[PDB]
Amino acid sequence: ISQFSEAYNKILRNSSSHSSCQLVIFVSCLNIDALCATKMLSLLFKKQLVQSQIVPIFGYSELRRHYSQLDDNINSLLLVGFGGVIDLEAFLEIDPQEQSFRRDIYVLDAHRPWNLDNIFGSQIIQCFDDGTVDDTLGEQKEAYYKLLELNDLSKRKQRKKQIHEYEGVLEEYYSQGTTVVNSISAQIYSLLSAIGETNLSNLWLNILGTTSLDIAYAQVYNRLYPLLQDEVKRLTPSSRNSVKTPDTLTLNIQPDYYLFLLRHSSLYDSFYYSNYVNAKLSLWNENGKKRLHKMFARMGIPLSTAQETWLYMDHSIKRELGIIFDKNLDRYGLQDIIRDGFVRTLGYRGSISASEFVEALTALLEVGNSAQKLTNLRKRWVSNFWLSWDALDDRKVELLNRGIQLAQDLQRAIFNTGVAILEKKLIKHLRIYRLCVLQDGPDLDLYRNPLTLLRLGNWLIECCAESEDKQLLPMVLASIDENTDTYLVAGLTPRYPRGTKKPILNNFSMAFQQITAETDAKVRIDNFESSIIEIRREDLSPFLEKLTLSGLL
Amino acid sequence: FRYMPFSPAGTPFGFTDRRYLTMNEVGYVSTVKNSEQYSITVSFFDVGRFREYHFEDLFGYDLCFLNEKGTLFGQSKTGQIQYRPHDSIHSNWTKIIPLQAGERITSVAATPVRVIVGTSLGYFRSFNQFGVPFAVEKTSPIVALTAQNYRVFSVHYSQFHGLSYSLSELGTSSKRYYKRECPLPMSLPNDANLDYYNFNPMGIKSLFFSSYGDPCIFGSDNTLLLLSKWRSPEESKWLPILDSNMEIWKMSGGKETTDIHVWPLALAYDTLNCILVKGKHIWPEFPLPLPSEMEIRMPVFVKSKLLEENEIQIPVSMAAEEEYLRSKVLSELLTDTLENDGEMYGNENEVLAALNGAYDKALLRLFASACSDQNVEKALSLAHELKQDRALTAAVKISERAELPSLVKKINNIREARYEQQLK
Amino acid sequence: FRYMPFSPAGTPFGFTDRRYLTMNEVGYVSTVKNSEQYSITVSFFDVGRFREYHFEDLFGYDLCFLNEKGTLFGQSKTGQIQYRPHDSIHSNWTKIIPLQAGERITSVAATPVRVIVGTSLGYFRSFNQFGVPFAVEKTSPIVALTAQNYRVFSVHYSQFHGLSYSLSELGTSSKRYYKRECPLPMSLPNINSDMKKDANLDYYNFNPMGIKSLFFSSYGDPCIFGSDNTLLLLSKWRSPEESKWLPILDSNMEIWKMSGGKETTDIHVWPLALAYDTLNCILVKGKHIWPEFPLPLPSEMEIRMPVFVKSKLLEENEIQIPVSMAAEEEYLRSKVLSELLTDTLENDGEMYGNENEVLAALNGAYDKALLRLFASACSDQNVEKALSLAHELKQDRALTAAVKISERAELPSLVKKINNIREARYEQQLK
């Protein structure tokens, strides 16, 4: 219902004064795509000359202590992706005060399950409803529309069953798993194009966020293979090379690989994550530590000209892999390596693509630093978030490589224990899933912050990405570092070996409502993403007993 | 003869895949070719007034015209046109113009209340701002169009006779003709230069209307022509008030290059807006050039005399003749504009007072030179061209210093004759 | 299409190294080249008023125009012009017109109050008698110019157009247009393949348009004489939508009648001056159509309307024309001249002081010549044709004479029809 140009002009006139008419935006730090959408919105507000206030919020239980206590004349609140599932208007009471209301938020939710009240019956929740979903549960035109108003003994009895007929279609709905169907990069960049501001930095920025979802889903960005192509041609800066210009930020395309961060460095530590790619084939160590030695130590890898040979004349060897894997194409047919990709340059200072670039932003968000420990743990993640947001200037150079050298040990750290829990053989296929409890190993500290955990699962979902022609169910892990057995337990998604036909989002959050509804015996859902909860030590064993019988898939 | 699609201030493709569709004082419209379609990108100079936008071209439009309210597109092969207003209140409309065998649309134009479409066979189809047809007229084939408000200015070129222009006004009662196919004095031309000639057979680089109501044209001969007194056919004539070759030569130092051309953008009462294009091609490419302003100069010079007297510099005595010709044309047009249309900005009286003061001052420099060479008779004719009464008093002091008592009494007879006519 | 420098009545060099620069009713200007320079000698027909003089040329001035007050010289290559007044009151002046590459001065003109300089690109630069520059005007390319002390007459032609005419006046405040680029249907010269070895090829190379001479008449009517040997006079020039060209003289019929029906080509007509009844010319005898050194005595040739048959003149026989045939030609000649003289006196007035005696004699001969055709219609019993001839009479005394011709021819019904015309004119005169 909200045409994209209209809300911008409408939010322009509501706070454009040179006083404390302050509009304030909110963003989570727990997602990479959540960042990059906000950054481009801020800078146009700079050149439209408006005063602002940016606050990060990491926790879903924290939202009350950051809004509902400190407000004076904020008319224009803005928020990025928080309330697609839980209704905030039930979470936070706002009485109707002063039909043409006095304070209006927007919302930029990116998730699949929506909330019917937030689009229909909108009076303060001006949601982003434009040509996003044209089929916003198109059967709803009589269910709640007759729930609003609700001889007659035989007539109303039928009328209660029609309500009960409406009740089931609101029972199967609001009982679905979640993803993000369309990235928040897609919306606001399309909005700016309706305004029409030509800067390649924007075109460099919007493609970053959709690149982040390349490891969570598949066919979401497969729709955006044209929308990457047309813009880099329509925003063609030049037909010539027009060489030796230190400026101008030229944009091109070049092929690239799952074997990653190569152009930055290390065909050495590729050896690990080449075996990641052979972990996608049939092994983790055994044949490859012979098999890699047909394809790799063919050239001893130098010290000085390796600044030139695996920077420059590896183009003789990328060609050679390009003429190796063309004859590994009709015979091997493993198509996880050749990819179209995208690249940028700075005139000088090396070529940096966007494949490796999202990798540095994840690790640099991680490292780079009763109830008395969680406060001094929660003040960390907001602070180290902040040194990643300013990473989008040229002014950060010698901090850019800091995350780079950080990243190529963290994988060496995370692979150091993944190989341990395999060889321990503590994965047990009980009946439905597989359960693993990392009770204690070395280096437990790097598992408090949840962004590492999805990567550990991302490595662990791919150890079981062999054929497995029955029981394609992901796992649930367990780890503990701190007191009272906090146990940030989480679930994963099943994966496809590039063949989504079946609708596999999640079943656990439906069950996560169930166990949280039972006894409230020290269970917590205070963390933001529903795929992560907490548990007590004496509750994880009756957790699974409630889960091995409650088959909700 | 081949009927090529013409656009206002358009540039050809060359060896590239991109070009400029149209160009004016509002902005510029360009197209970028990709793998399967075309992509139209519209950029403006005043970013703070209008919202910049772009869209994909599925049909493949090659004709464009830009005014202060919208953008009009046209297809020469299928006759499909589309008008896109900048405001979201007005809805888009699409209609297909009927075309015969071998008929191609050569020029389009748009005003906020009327739509002008011209073809190669001379069919004149006019629409309103909603698409409702009013009349179908059969005239000469239109090859170039320009419009400000009501007026329709078409350049006609047939197969045998050719080279003519028409001037009309789309009034509320009926269409009135001020000129009925008068001959155009534009000079026709007798690799960058080779490719430009095929796409543009007449050599018309750009054409637009001035801010003071006079039609301007800029042909291949690089001479700015000014049509003065268009409301009266008895005194309607073309005035070449600016010569390209003279302006580049004086500012540079006394030389003349080849790669520095002058593309016209707009003329707003003092200078001609331009883009300095440096290179082999005569058409610009994509960098963002800064707009420049060239001061207006009458093309009256000798070439052998400037080399003997030596950026090339012009002396005092020689510049007085050029200053007299420039001020005489501008003062006559500004006087007729205010007495018929009135003020437009509110500061026309200060411009007129400063121009009339410099006109009488420049004539006194030539008046002083005639007295030094003892030519009393030439000095008598110069005194009659003065407008202000204070200029006649200053002419007496120049005459007494040059020891000519007979010339002094002749100035006083002009003063008594003007006072008698003023009291009648 | 390359242009050529045009002058009034100019002749080319031919097989010699000398030629005439210009020629008019005032005199003639010739030049003699003796291996390094040119020697311009200006001779006049009136030895009593002005004195013949000559000088040495060091710039090679080929363009010239002569009027009653001075002599103007112009250079087509460097653009240097020079005006030389005959009287000792005004001093000589020299100015150089700036010209670009390719652009050349094709025709010059000089009036006593304005200076007219025309170029090949169509630039119109006008100067006054003191040298003050005026506004620059850009128009069509000028190939021919003529003037008589007050107005500017320009002829335009290009490679993608055709011959036109313009009439304007250079006033004190601004330029006023009487005629603005109206089409002129004058025939172009048809050079064939056999003309490449002819001796008259040199005349068409210096003048491709074939314009031999052009000048204004004594009463103010524009005249032009092209390569088609037909004298064209512009009638009704005060009305732009009513302007008409009327041919009143043709040389192609007069040569054949005077030579006794022969087919020789050694007789031509070169127009010098025309003051309402006689075109002054020189009888040039020889192969060349252009004059050379020493000029013969001028002869007089009265104007005649070109209305004759060729087979009928041979059957009825210097060739002589009968009475009956000459009455039709006399009616056409007098009708054109009486209409132009009437409009001239009612708008411009008298010029010499004897226009009333010319008008009275012309109107008397007009009514007398119509009665000869009126008598022939009554003899062949055509009563209806005689009725239309009576309405063309102007004088009241001519209607009385028509009654006596009708009574002698025994037509009583024709007599009463003349009286109805008389009563109708008296009623209109009293309103």
From Swiss-Prot, chain A:
Keywords assigned by UniProt, alphabetized: Cell cycle, DNA replication, Nucleus, Phosphoprotein
InterPro entries, sorted: CDC45
Gene Ontology CC: CMG complex; DNA replication preinitiation complex; nuclear replication fork; nucleus
Subunit and interaction comment: Assembles into a complex with MCM5/CDC46. Interacts with MCM10.
Gene, per the UniProt record: CDC45
Subcellular location field: Nucleus
Known role: Required for initiation of chromosomal DNA replication. Acts at the origin of replication. Also has a role in minichromosome maintenance.
Name of the featured protein: Cell division control protein 45
Curated annotation (Swiss-Prot), chain B:
First and last residues of every WD repeat: 219-259
Main location: nucleus
Cellular location(s): Nucleus
GO molecular function: chromatin binding; identical protein binding
Example GO BP: DNA-templated DNA replication
Keywords annotated in UniProt: DNA replication, Nucleus, Phosphoprotein, Repeat, WD repeat
GO cellular component: Cul8-RING ubiquitin ligase complex; nuclear chromosome; nuclear replication fork; nucleus
Miscellaneous remark of the record: Present with 3280 molecules/cell in log phase SD medium.
Function of the protein: Accessory factor for DNA replication. It plays a role in accurately duplicating the genome in vivo.
Protein name (Swiss-Prot/TrEMBL): DNA polymerase alpha-binding protein
Source species of the chain: Saccharomyces cerevisiae (strain ATCC 204508 / S288c)
Gene: CTF4
From Swiss-Prot, chain C:
Annotated keywords: DNA replication, Nucleus, Phosphoprotein, Repeat, WD repeat
Location of the protein in the cell: Nucleus
Gene Ontology terms: cellular component: Cul8-RING ubiquitin ligase complex; nuclear chromosome; nuclear replication fork; nucleus
GO biological process entries: DNA repair; DNA replication initiation; DNA-templated DNA replication; double-strand break repair via break-induced replication; establishment of sister chromatid cohesion; mitotic cell cycle; mitotic sister chromatid cohesion; nucleosome assembly
Gene Ontology terms, MF aspect: chromatin binding; identical protein binding
WD repeats (start-end): 226-266
Domain of life from the UniProt record: Eukaryota
Biological function: Accessory factor for DNA replication. It plays a role in accurately duplicating the genome in vivo.
Other comments on record: Present with 3280 molecules/cell in log phase SD medium.
Protein name per Swiss-Prot or TrEMBL: DNA polymerase alpha-binding protein
Source organism per UniProt: Saccharomyces cerevisiae (strain ATCC 204508 / S288c) (Baker's yeast)
Gene: CTF4
Residues represented out of the complete protein: 474 to 927 of 927
